[PDB]
């Protein structure tokens, strides 16, 4: 049995840490919802 408990509002943080590149990947979405690399 799973339960939910609240963790925050949904708002944009103007002081956020910025990180992460912007790659483009050729991918496939199989019948079970799993992305694979092409």
């Amino acid at each position: 049995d799973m339960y939910i408990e609240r963790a925050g509002d949904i708002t944009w943080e103007k002081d956020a840490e910025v990180t992460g590149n912007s790659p483009r990947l050729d991918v496939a979405l199989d019948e079970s919802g799993d992305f694979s690399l092409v």
Partner: protein
């Protein structure tokens, strides 16, 4: 509790309380990702949220009503991932998304690696709309993670 906002999805079938994923509650409907709950029903205090719609190919499921989240990446601007990691504070992470190129179109993607129980954390545009859910993605040459910006219809 059905106040709009971000929620943790916990369980106790293993060692203690264990965060298996995250979700967003909007307009009375609870939106998470299918692999978090595998469709099973959830509890919120007294209540019980039962699944309403789901799709294993999209890796999405909504509870107590139809999918309500319809904002999309404009593409151009950066976005924030409101990561709710297990045992840890909700934290906003700004990034500029990349691209999953598929046969049916392109999807936004965030190159952000977080523990497995962060799945279902929302991704926001600069005006606050939820544009997708973190957690379904790929592993790259470098070994770390790239998640799609998964949105419903």
């Amino acid at each position: 509790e059905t106040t709009d906002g971000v929620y943790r999805v916990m369980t106790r079938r293993l060692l203690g309380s264990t965060q298996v994923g995250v979700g967003v509650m909007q307009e009375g409907v609870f939106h998470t990702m299918w692999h978090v709950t595998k469709g099973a029903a959830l509890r919120s205090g007294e209540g019980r949220l039962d699944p309403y719609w789901g799709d294993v190919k999209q890796d999405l499921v909504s509870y107590c009503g139809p999918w309500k989240l319809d904002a999309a990446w404009d593409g151009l601007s950066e976005v924030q991932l409101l990561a709710v990691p297990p045992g840890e504070r909700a934290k906003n992470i700004q990034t500029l998304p990349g691209i999953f190129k598929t046969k049916d179109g392109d999807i936004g993607a965030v190159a952000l690696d977080y523990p497995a129980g962060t799945s279902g954390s929302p991704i926001l545009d600069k005006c606050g709309r939820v544009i997708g859910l973190y957690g379904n993605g790929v592993v790259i040459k470098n070994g770390s993670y790239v998640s799609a910006i998964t949105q419903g219809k």
